[PDB]
DNA sequence: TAAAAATTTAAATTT
DNA sequence: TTTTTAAAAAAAATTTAAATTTTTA
DNA sequence: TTTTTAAAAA
């Protein structure tokens, strides 16, 4: 995540921001960034401090979140993929390290809350404590496995290969809630999947194109810039923030003239503040190749997916009826082509 | 340094109502000819061709081929400022931020300016070529709103059966299953009930209907819906505005 | 192979419309005299009786007692495609659960064919006639309607109380304490919007009132209600639809 | 024992259709010689003063100075059970807690008996006096609706500037700068339609919009608003109910 | 001119 | 004074049941 | 993973 690139944009460009509607793609094959999805239910599912539950012990709210946002989303015409995380690298482990110890400290004021008797404060504090688990990604990919759904085991981080998938043009979006997609390559980045109600978080699209015509830069540039902001992999410049960067890059290159230019009295470089490689991954990174594997949205199966996600799960059965009959309500095939098939673009128009 | 005064205001209010529920980021096309609109949705399903000409407009002077681009849902709110009687006048100057509209009352006594602002905007130009469609049907409006709005009652999908004894819109679904003919007109002579159904081959194709209900949204523009289309080609859903030209709609059938 | 040719197809709309949200799930009796309907409501305290009588269509063809199970949420938003002055002729299959709808204009411009998918449910009888009826009320449809929306403002519960020289209708609750009493009106010389009443025995009963606001939506049907109740027996509230047939709404009293 | 038949039913329909969604709690402050209402429930200052005189009622008959509270959206319920046409009487025993609302329908069919429980709730007036109002405008109340009701969707400032050539309704805000301006028409042999102006110094004075929205949803009392404000005075938004008495409004301007 | 009817919001449950 | 860092605030979705606009004539 | 935003800071 990069920490004020949304706000960057709105700033800036906002040409490249279109907050569409839900409905409007019909059609549209995104990709799920499927571990923010998982967290984003895991978080906000919940019995006002109690996440739903099994008789097994064992949590049911992300899976009844991608079920229904899933369901909402194919009845309106999306057609996703849910690309899950797999092994993040080494350079990410600093970042990494200071969101457990974030976590260790909401375990240790956790206690606190759970002494003092706050109702509200337990709640909010056991937010805090969500882990995504190999039994969670093999548990969610178990019911896409059962959708019909697919979902793409990448070997790095989920965003890098959203943005492979984007760019081999397989997909047409990458539907994702944090910036990363943007500095990893992809043109198109839809965020805030909140399918339920319209005006609450609307559609709005990230065009990466857009942001490399009106500001000028190439695709590196906008990689040396994320890092000026600061990512998870690699620390921003101590006195330099969002506004120092778009002048600091925009007139400008790349490092090395940051490095030969900026004197380090006053906006000091940090110490072992490794760039050479995470400019590197961020340009080609570790994906599965989607010329390879091919999207199925299948047939979904029927009657142990009703027994598995009722009878294991504690579900009533009309429920996941009405949303498997409503997936295969969606799923007719007929699909919508695009304008840009039939008509050719003649060029644009300035303002 | 534009200025366009209409002297029937209702029909950029019905154009700006056509107009605001399908596509929000417009470029407005201004040449010293007339005044065009050559926009799409979003999602790329569904294209907007609005054309104002000069022979309509009582007072057009527009002296450079200067393109502006508003917010369509605002300038949406500023059409449903003005009522249905109102003289409009349009006011804008060169590289302007802002675009008057000028709202003159028919018994002068409400004169409401109104400067909206603009925004920095690009829409993409897509040439559609002067071409022969096969079925062109032309078929009154509100009938029009009555097919696209009980077809979206039943399903997603209307697929139009063109013949050359009437054009038949059937749509199907979980609801039941629709199937409406729409013959031609023997015995009507009357151009705002005429119903014709003039042919060059048979066609089959499959539309959507949220955006034929955005499309038939431009009801009160004309009478007449000049439904031009082929066997290939998305359909032009054209409503001809009195003496200033034609606002056309294009949608991409599903296959 | 059901076939029933109406004229006036906004009576099957309206009463489509007037059916919709008290009855999810319905069953059609077709005689071949006419076509019934006896089904329960959702929560399964009220029940519904309609009836359109053969006399009424212009053409009418049956040849089996065929019963099929019909949305009516579903088959509202098919009649909501007709026109108000746009024919309805209904169509069945022996072999395939549809029901087939074309709906032809006034002139031969526009066929609108429309079939349907048949549910598959139970069917049975509860009509129960001849309950002897204390005292009928014949009032005036968008005058009940207005009764009704009226009092629904205040409570849930009504009571309605009835005497020679009027009926009234009155409610409770925290918003407040209504008490309408509609008088006779059998003087004016329109019979339409006349309110006329006959009693044996003077009845005082809690009614419900939300399934009552479900039942007042009929008004655009017949313009005159013919409500008759007793002291435990449950009321009527008939729509004498014009040369076509009755509608009925039962209610037992809370 | 008070007693207020008020033939002409509709005016307290639509006044408490008005005070519907403006005041929840209201005292309504009945004398021997009028009924009278002074109260606020909002955080900005929305004094809404109503004057509803005994000669213009078909029988008044009040021997107490009683103010009762009312919960007024029930009662604004109880309103608008009735209807347009509807002969509307008022009373209010003295040992009961009842307002005891009847309604005589004009046919003599429909006679109801409404009893709105009340509740004891005390609030204190202000009282505003007539204090030299400078710049009163007399002019429609449609007129008056439609620029507040679209100048609410520009933004929510409105500056009202006044001369002796016609009142000037500003509004600017996140979309664009609305300059409704107005013509004093005394020419027009309509005298519901003639705007006349009396101004003794011009006025600019921000007010806010959804206060004044609800302010302006008093529209059916009365053909004319009898709209007069001063430098530094509050907003006065008068509905002079024809031989009724007056509907006022009190806006504190936004400085 | 009003009321069906499409539409939007908030609240308890979705376990 | 704009800005950068810092310490907080937070991550849905369905049915159910009033509420607020649009259209119908 | 996100946004604010109210103190600090060059």
Same mark, same amino acid.
């Given at each position: 995540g990069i920490q004020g690139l949304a706000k960057l944009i709105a700033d800036?460009?906002?040409?490249?921001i279109?907050?569409?509607?839900?409905?409007?793609?019909?059609?549209?094959?995104?990709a799920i960034d499927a571990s923010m999805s998982i967290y984003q239910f895991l978080i906000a599912?919940?019995?006002?401090?109690?996440?739903?539950?099994?008789? !097994?012990?064992? $949590?049911?709210?992300?899976?009844?979140?991608?079920?229904?946002? $899933?369901?909402?989303?194919?009845?309106?015409?999306?057609?996703?993929?849910?690309v899950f995380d797999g092994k993040p690298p080494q350079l990410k482990s600093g970042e990494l390290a200071k969101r457990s110890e974030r976590r260790?400290?909401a375990?240790?004021?956790?206690?606190?809350?759970?002494?003092?008797?706050? !109702?509200?404060?337990?709640?909010?504090?056991?937010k805090r404590?969500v882990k995504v688990?190999?039994?969670?990604?093999?548990?969610?990919?178990?019911?896409?496995?059962?959708?019909?759904?697919?979902?793409?085991?990448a070997?790095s981080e989920a965003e890098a290969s959203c943005a492979?998938?984007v760019?081999?043009?397989? /997909?047409?979006?990458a539907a994702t809630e944090d910036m990363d997609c943007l500095t990893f390559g992809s043109? /198109?980045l839809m965020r805030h999947l909140?399918?339920?109600?319209?005006?609450?978080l609307?559609?709005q699209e990230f065009?990466l194109?857009?942001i490399?015509?009106?500001?000028?830069?190439?695709?590196?540039?906008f990689v040396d810039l994320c890092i000026l902001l600061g990512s998870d992999y690699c620390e921003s410049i101590?006195?330099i923030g969002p506004?120092?960067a778009?002048?600091?890059?925009?007139?400008?290159?790349?490092?090395?003239?940051?490095?030969?230019?900026?004197?380090?009295?006053?906006?000091?470089?940090?110490?072992?503040w490794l760039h050479?490689?995470a400019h590197?991954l961020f340009?080609?990174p570790?994906?599965?190749?989607?010329?390879?594997? !091919?999207?199925?949205?299948?047939?979904?199966?029927?009657?142990?997916?009703?027994?598995?996600?009722?009878?294991?799960?504690?579900?009533? !059965?009309?429920?996941?009826?009405?949303? /498997?009959?409503?997936?295969?309500?969606?799923?007719?095939?007929?699909?919508?082509?695009?304008?840009?098939?039939?008509?050719?673009? $003649?060029?644009?128009?300035?303002? | 340094?534009?200025?366009?005064?209409?002297?029937?205001?209702?029909?950029?209010?019905?154009?700006?109502?056509?107009?605001?529920?399908?596509?929000?980021?417009?470029?407005?096309?201004?040449?010293?000819?007339?005044?065009?609109?050559?926009?799409?949705?979003? =999602?790329?399903?569904?294209?907007?061709?609005?054309?104002?000409?000069?022979?309509?407009?009582?007072?057009?002077?527009?002296?450079?081929?200067?393109?502006?681009?508003?917010?369509?849902?605002?300038?949406?709110?500023?059409?449903?400022?003005?009522?249905?009687?109102?003289?409009?006048?349009?006011?804008?100057?060169?590289?302007?931020?802002?675009?008057?509209?000028?709202?003159?009352?028919?018994?002068?006594?409400?004169?409401?300016?109104?400067?909206?602002?603009?925004?920095?905007?690009?829409?993409?130009?897509?040439?559609?070529?002067?071409?022969?469609?096969?079925?062109?049907?032309?078929?009154? =409006?509100?009938?029009?709103?009555?097919?696209?709005?009980?077809?979206?009652?039943?399903?997603?999908?209307?697929?139009?059966?063109?013949?050359?004894?009437?054009?038949?819109?059937?749509?199907?679904?979980?609801?039941?299953?629709?199937?409406?003919?729409? =013959?031609?007109? =023997?015995?009507?002579?009357?151009?705002?009930?005429?119903?014709?159904?003039?042919?060059?081959?048979?066609?089959?194709?499959?539309?959507?209907?949220?955006?034929?209900?955005?499309?038939?949204?431009?009801?009160?523009?004309?009478?007449?819906?000049?439904?031009?289309?082929?066997?290939?080609?998305?359909?032009?859903?054209?409503?001809?505005?009195?003496?200033?030209?034609?606002?056309?709609?294009?949608?991409?059938?599903?296959?």
């Amino acid at each position: 995540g990069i920490q004020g690139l949304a706000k960057l944009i709105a700033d800036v460009a906002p040409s490249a921001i279109r907050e569409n509607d839900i409905k409007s793609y019909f059609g549209r094959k995104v990709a799920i960034d499927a571990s923010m999805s998982i967290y984003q239910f895991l978080i906000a599912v919940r019995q006002g401090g109690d996440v739903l539950q099994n008789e !097994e012990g064992e $949590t049911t709210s992300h899976l009844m979140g991608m079920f229904y946002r $899933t369901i909402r989303m194919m009845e309106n015409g999306i057609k996703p993929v849910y690309v899950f995380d797999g092994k993040p690298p080494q350079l990410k482990s600093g970042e990494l390290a200071k969101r457990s110890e974030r976590r260790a400290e909401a375990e240790k004021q956790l206690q606190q809350a759970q002494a003092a008797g706050a !109702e509200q404060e337990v709640e909010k504090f056991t937010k805090r404590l969500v882990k995504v688990t190999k039994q969670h990604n093999d548990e969610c990919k178990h019911l896409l496995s059962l959708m019909g759904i697919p979902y793409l085991d990448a070997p790095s981080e989920a965003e890098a290969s959203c943005a492979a998938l984007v760019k081999a043009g397989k /997909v047409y979006a990458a539907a994702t809630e944090d910036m990363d997609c943007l500095t990893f390559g992809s043109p /198109v980045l839809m965020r805030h999947l909140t399918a339920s109600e319209a005006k609450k978080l609307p559609i709005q699209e990230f065009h990466l194109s857009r942001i490399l015509q009106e500001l000028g830069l190439n695709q590196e540039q906008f990689v040396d810039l994320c890092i000026l902001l600061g990512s998870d992999y690699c620390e921003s410049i101590r006195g330099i923030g969002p506004k120092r960067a778009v002048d600091l890059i925009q007139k400008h290159k790349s490092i090395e003239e940051i490095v030969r230019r900026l004197d380090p009295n006053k906006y000091p470089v940090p110490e072992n503040w490794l760039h050479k490689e995470a400019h590197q991954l961020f340009l080609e990174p570790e994906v599965l190749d989607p010329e390879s594997v !091919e999207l199925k949205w299948s047939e979904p199966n029927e009657e142990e997916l009703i027994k598995f996600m009722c009878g294991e799960k504690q579900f009533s !059965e009309e429920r996941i009826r009405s949303g /498997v009959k409503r997936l295969s309500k969606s799923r007719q095939g007929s699909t919508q082509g695009r304008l840009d098939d039939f008509f050719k673009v $003649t060029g644009s128009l300035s303002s | 340094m534009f200025e366009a005064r209409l002297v029937q205001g209702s029909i950029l209010k019905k154009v700006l109502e056509a107009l605001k529920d399908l596509i929000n980021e417009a470029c407005w096309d201004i040449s010293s000819s007339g005044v065009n609109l050559q926009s799409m949705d979003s =999602s790329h399903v569904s294209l907007v061709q609005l054309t104002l000409r000069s022979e309509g407009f009582d007072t057009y002077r527009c002296d450079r081929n200067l393109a502006m681009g508003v917010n369509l849902t605002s300038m949406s709110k500023i059409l449903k400022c003005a009522g249905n009687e109102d003289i409009i006048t349009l006011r804008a100057e060169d590289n302007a931020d802002t675009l008057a509209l000028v709202f003159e009352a028919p018994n002068q006594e409400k004169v409401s300016d109104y400067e909206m602002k603009l925004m920095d905007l690009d829409v993409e130009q897509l040439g559609i070529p002067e071409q022969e469609y096969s079925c062109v049907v032309k078929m009154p =409006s509100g009938e029009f709103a009555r097919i696209c709005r009980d077809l979206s009652h039943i399903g997603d999908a209307v697929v139009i059966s063109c013949a050359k004894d009437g054009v038949k819109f059937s749509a199907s679904g979980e609801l039941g299953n629709g199937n409406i003919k729409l =013959s031609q007109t =023997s015995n009507v002579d009357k151009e705002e009930e005429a119903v014709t159904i003039e042919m060059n081959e048979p066609v089959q194709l499959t539309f959507a209907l949220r955006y034929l209900n955005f499309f038939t949204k431009a009801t009160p523009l004309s009478s007449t819906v000049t439904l031009s289309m082929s066997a290939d080609v998305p359909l032009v859903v054209e409503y001809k505005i009195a003496d200033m030209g034609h606002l056309k709609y294009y949608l991409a059938p599903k296959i």
